[PDB]
Amino acid sequence: QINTEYAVSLLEQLKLFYEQQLFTDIVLIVEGTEFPCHKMVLATCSSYFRAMFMSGLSESKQTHVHLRNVDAATLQIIITYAYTGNLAMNDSTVEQLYETACFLQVEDVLQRCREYLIKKINAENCVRLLSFADLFSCEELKQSAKRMVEHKFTAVYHQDAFMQLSHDLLIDILSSDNLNVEKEETVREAAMLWLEYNTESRSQYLSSVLSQIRIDALSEVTQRAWFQGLPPNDKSVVVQGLYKSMPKFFKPRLGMTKEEMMIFIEASSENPCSLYSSVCYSPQAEKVYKLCSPPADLHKVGTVVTPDNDIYIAGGQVPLKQTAFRTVNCFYWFDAQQNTWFPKTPMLFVRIKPSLVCCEGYIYAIGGDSVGGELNRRTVERYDTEKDEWTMVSPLPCAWQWSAAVVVHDCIYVMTLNLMYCYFPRSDSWVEMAMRQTSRSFASAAAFGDKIFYIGGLGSSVTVEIYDVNKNEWKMAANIPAKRYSDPCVRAVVISNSLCVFMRETHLNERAKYVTYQYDLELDRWSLRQHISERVLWDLGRDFRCTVGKLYPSCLEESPWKP
């Protein structure tokens, strides 16, 4: 191999020459700023300077070149990267950095900024990044922007930059089958408002934008509104659209295929080669669709589903390369369509079984057996979904183990064996709450409306303690009627605007039975909503978690397994 010591010595000597200006022969003249540099470094880094000096033209020989349509700071950072390899990339100058990299055709900085932008893609810059990837040919960025823009924009459709988009880009966006919309009318009104941004600059594109939307809205309202905005005496558009909506037979999209499903993680691996797998139950389809394995079989993790219906994974441990397990603070995000886990910004401290709770767009991970183990080991930390970073919050006053947390009334409610503390995000403080009369642990709670339903606790039992936020008191309702001499595995969840329970029971010398019940809020009784047949759902285990979310049956595949 090439001697790295001599390579770094040569590089540092060249950078010293650059700083001291000894062997510089070509100077870059940009907006009156002198940039003394060498030809060898520029040729090695950029693919434009190799064609600038080895050409045989006027500026090729001229020791003074007036490089135009560039920026001084961008050129300076590119030159210093070419001379030392350090590329300091902030969150603002990456746009002009990519512009100058494409202008100068430098592959290394182009790849680096492409990776930075593939990491930086978020909701508030999705349309801007897609427009940038349309301006400069970049297929990876274009595809990532396609996916993220489709999802987040069809969720939001309010960005100001969406109005200033090319016709081809909008045709690609609207005609795609990856849009995430609960209805087919929101895309219609989004297209209408985009068209009405201008009057005559969009008339020619009117015949094309309607060609990608289904005819179910091409004969109903929002056709006379276009006639109102039609240019005067234009008889080539009204009669055109009058007899035009014959083709494009109505085809349902993919965004209207989200159903309230119970996502399960760390289930018992059907194949014995695997350790733990992830499955999902369909309360409506009455089937069990398989889910992608956790990233690097990440066990002992926590789940959260934001009001925007997004799944996240935090904490967990990976078997170190017989008992062998090491805890890692890696963070991941689940793609609802690609059926894969996209990595995100990792946490600061590793966790085991963390309680992920979403509130005000922030992901809160409370506790989880942190390696820190200091005086305030009860330190909790939130995540920024806008800036893609983690921020510490007010620590929990008391150290708790095997706890659960929910969000009610824009506040974090973490529950332990007998104590409860409410966190105020506005003031970053903890307030003492009501005290339970029973010592129970290893249970889960579901937030339904303005009440907290702590179900089960210790196997578990059928004890239920209902807490009211407005009343600040713990009261008993009833006990779930289950078979005696059994060990039910209770799982509290909210579904169909009602509090249902996923309770798996096992009898003596008998296999586990799956059945869910609907708890009557006013009657204080668990009614049999549906019985899960064992012909579709097999054993899941004991350390499995359940959460409420929506998934697409089309993108996912049915798990092939014998009843």
Partner: protein, 207 residues
Amino acid sequence: MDEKYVNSIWDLLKNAIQEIQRKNNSGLSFEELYRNAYTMVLHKHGEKLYTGLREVVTEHLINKVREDVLNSLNNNFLQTLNQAWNDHQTAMVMIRDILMYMDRVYVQQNNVENVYNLGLIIFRDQVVRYGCIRDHLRQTLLDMIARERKGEVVDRGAIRNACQMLMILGLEGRSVYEEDFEAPFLEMSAEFFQMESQKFLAENSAS
């Protein structure tokens, strides 16, 4: 921006390219060429730019080298062809530099051949594979190789240069050059060696 601005940019770029092809690239500047490439790939008019480049290159070829080769088909025909090929290559060096900066995005998006390949293909179509130049070149190469085989010595580096030029003109491998040169050369041998063997079997013995 407006169509007038991009039209003026394309017009000046075409003028610069024509001046470069007139062997006046030394007087032209690459600072001008890089800026023109910047303002050309700015409005994402790659299609129009590619079509204009193809039209300019083919018009220049047909006007200059097609006339030059036909005008000197008997006075240093192969030497003139080699000189024209060298001039085309040395202009296409810079032409390919600029339009290869363009080609990165263009052929990574539109999935077409690069501008160097485009120039090679158009040169093959308009010069070597011409309806009259091809047969003349074949006949003259066969005549000179036959005269060399007869016993008298002729120029040999020129044939190597021509064969290398055809091999490069293949642009993918040995598809065209094997068909345009090797096949007629094999047919020439199919007859010369048969006649030589027929003469030798009767004019001598097995010793």
